[PDB]
């Protein structure tokens, strides 16, 4: 998850956030997800109109080794 000689998280390049794939940075449903629950033109069902989610590798830290991205030991 780190980068060349650096504790920086690659997935987000030290930012703590990623773009919403579903809306593809748009903000509105493009297909009918959840069959009869999410339409194909309503607000994005995930981000809900922000086109940005939290990174998983690092829970909003920007770096790897830490107490927000490790198993307690």
């Amino acid at each position: 998850g780190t980068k060349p000689n650096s504790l920086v998280c690659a997935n987000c390049e030290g930012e703590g956030c990623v773009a919403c794939s579903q809306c593809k940075g748009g903000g509105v449903n493009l297909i009918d997800h959840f069959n009869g629950q999410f339409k194909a033109g309503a607000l994005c069902w995930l981000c809900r109109g922000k086109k940005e989610v939290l990174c998983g590798d690092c829970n909003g830290a920007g770096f790897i080794g830490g107490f927000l991205s490790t198993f307690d030991e």
């Binding site: 995930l46 198993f71 030991e73």
Partner: protein
């Protein structure tokens, strides 16, 4: 001192440390000097009958894999310790032994406490079986969460997040270790707002909920004041830090809880300064035994869902010491002595760190339904908010428990169980898109 023909008695305290003698010192001579530098301080009968008031080395073994390493065994008489005192036990066995120059590194590993000495202690306030009856929860592991980051929030806003998480389906809610009383939030008005949210969430779900309230203070007069105010509001549980507050203050708090019906939660802070290196300090398995005698119901132990063979046995070794009643000798798991607790209550372990939904099958299979799981950024990071975030964790847990009671391996069938479950819960679905799967 070295009496290889010595036979330990049934009322003796035994210890075992590893040593790294300087080049030149013979191993059999170094061992006898550790037993003397711990008790009298001499090898002659010049100042003397004393005789029986001294320690003795009765065994020496060479450590495999390293040429300069040995294991020593020492025995101590029973009349050298004060009844009911944990402070006296540490100050006598180790008051000046790491300052010895003829050595380079020393580490204490294990201790054996005879039943004739354990009967003078009170032990945990309630235990395991009694605690489960007070909460009316059976079958599965308990859940919890902690408001970690934030900081600077007002008392009103602090109680807002507590109400949201508890309503979602969680059982407990924690505080932060470095929050006692500060200009941005005082302790008395934080207690008032927290207790108000507990009562509201108990009327919608009809289940018992709680929250750990920090009671650490700078003086013993101030620490006891905060414990009595938690009883007037009918709170069920408190919290303390037993490594920076001291052993004397911890024993006083344990006695109060037993006489008033309160649960105690223990956090281990500053511990990494003592038990991280492999050749100097005191192993954590020794400090766990001292906590059981002093008093406590919960304790932090760390996650092992990220270890390998060789490891995952040392940690599994001392988990049994906190819950079982009779543990046999096993050197492969780091147990040097056979211990009997003569019917003493157990302690519930707590696992924490950065965990999420895809870790449900792993934790359940290893620990069993006798532990508490705590979540940090895995609950407050949901894209929809706090309350929907707690719904995802509950769902996943129930799934694993059910599968287990149908004969389904949780070690293999795991990603499958989670997936087929995200096929009737929109909240879990969204969460399964933020975090990635486990190979």
């Amino acid at each position: 001192y070295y009496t290889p023909d010595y036979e330990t008695k049934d009322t003796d305290i035994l210890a075992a440390f590893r040593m790294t003698p300087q080049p030149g010192v013979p191993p059999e001579e170094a061992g006898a000097a550790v037993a003397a530098e711990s008790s009298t301080g001499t090898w002659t009968t010049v100042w003397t009958s004393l005789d029986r008031y001294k320690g003795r080395c009765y065994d020496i073994e060479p450590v495999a894999g390293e040429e300069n390493q040995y294991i020593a065994y020492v025995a101590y008489p029973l009349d050298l310790f004060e009844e009911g005192s944990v402070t006296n036990m540490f100050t006598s066995i180790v008051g000046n032994v790491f300052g010895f120059k003829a050595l380079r590194a020393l580490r204490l590993e294990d201790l054996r406490i005879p039943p004739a000495y354990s009967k003078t202690f009170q032990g945990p306030p309630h235990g395991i079986q009694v605690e489960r009856d007070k909460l009316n929860k059976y079958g599965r592991p308990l859940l919890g969460c902690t408001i970690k980051p934030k900081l600077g929030l007002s008392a009103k806003n602090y109680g807002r997040a507590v109400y949201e998480c508890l309503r979602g389906g969680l059982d407990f809610t924690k505080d932060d270790e470095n929050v006692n009383s500060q200009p941005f939030m005082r302790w008395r008005d934080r207690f008032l707002f927290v207790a108000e949210a507990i009562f509201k969430s108990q009327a919608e779900t009809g289940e018992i909920k709680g929250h750990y309230l920090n009671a650490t203070a700078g003086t013993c007069e101030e620490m006891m004041k905060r414990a009595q105010f938690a009883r007037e509001l009918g709170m069920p549980i408190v919290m303390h830090d037993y490594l920076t507050g001291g052993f004397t203050a911890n024993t006083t708090l344990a006695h109060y809880c037993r006489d008033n019906g309160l649960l105690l939660h223990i956090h281990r802070a500053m511990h990494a300064v003592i038990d991280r290196q492999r050749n100097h300090g005191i192993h954590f398995r020794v400090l766990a035994k001292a906590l059981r005698m002093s008093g406590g119901d919960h304790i932090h132990s760390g996650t092992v869902v990220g270890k390998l063979e060789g490891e995952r046995e040392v940690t599994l070794g001392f988990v049994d010491l906190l819950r079982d009643d009779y543990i046999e000798k096993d050197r492969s798991r780091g147990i040097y002595f056979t211990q009997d607790w003569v019917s003493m209550p157990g302690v519930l372990p707590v696992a924490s760190g950065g965990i999420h939904v895809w870790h449900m099958p792993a934790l359940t299979e290893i620990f069993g339904d006798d532990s508490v799981l705590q979540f940090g950024g895995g609950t407050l990071g949901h894209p929809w908010g706090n309350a929907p975030g707690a719904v995802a964790n509950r769902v996943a847990l129930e799934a694993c428990v059910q599968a287990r009671n149908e004969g389904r391996d949780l070690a293999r069938e795991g990603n499958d169980i989670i997936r087929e479950a995200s096929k009737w819960s929109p909240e879990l679905a969204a969460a399964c898109e933020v975090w990635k799967e486990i190979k």
